[PDB]
């Protein structure tokens, strides 16, 4: 009902992109267990600085797949109300499972 996976890259919009959803909790009816941030796993890629005849170090840099998730034991339809509103993600893909 209420396992909901807040994906994303942008990280400062997940401590807020969730803290705001867990407040449809304290508004709809659900003693909600806040954002559970299941581990980030990272797809980093290292690549030769120069275009020819470097080779020793390069510069690495990561693509931190961030991740969180949300919970409760209570799912009324006023919940459904809030969730169709207050949507504030710049680019933070979110899915739902029951």
């Amino acid at each position: 009902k209420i396992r909901i996976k807040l994906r994303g890259f942008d990280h400062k919009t997940l401590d807020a992109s969730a803290q705001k959803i867990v407040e449809a909790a304290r508004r709809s009816g659900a003693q909600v267990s806040g954002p559970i941030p299941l581990p980030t796993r990272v797809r980093r890629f290292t690549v030769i600085r120069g275009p020819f005849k470097h080779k020793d170090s390069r510069e690495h840099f990561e693509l931190r797949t961030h991740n969180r998730l949300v919970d409760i034991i209570n799912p009324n339809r006023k919940t459904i109300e809030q969730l169709m509103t207050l949507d504030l993600p710049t680019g933070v893909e979110i899915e739902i499972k029951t």
Partner: protein
Amino acid sequence: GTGRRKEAVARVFLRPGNGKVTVNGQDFNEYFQGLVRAVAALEPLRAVDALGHFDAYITVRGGGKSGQIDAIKLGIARALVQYNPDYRAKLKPLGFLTRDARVVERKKYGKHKARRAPQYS
């Protein structure tokens, strides 16, 4: 209470009895099963007297192997020494109260191993 070494994480919970010391469903001597280096973690117990007045249910997970054994060093005498103020009188003094950041360092920089640079001639 708890301890860590090479991301060797050792959960140490102490109870009195006598001669009881088991981990991941093995008795500590059949866990290392011959490895006399190992018999040394349970040695702050020896530091000030605590020979057999304190048995051990601990669960270490992850990290090392033989270094996994030092993980139970500050997993024990730091969850253990929780009680007794006059008890730290041998852990700051006798050097036993540290995590030791001695950890494997990042392979880097087109070296072979973060230090061993390639050959040369």
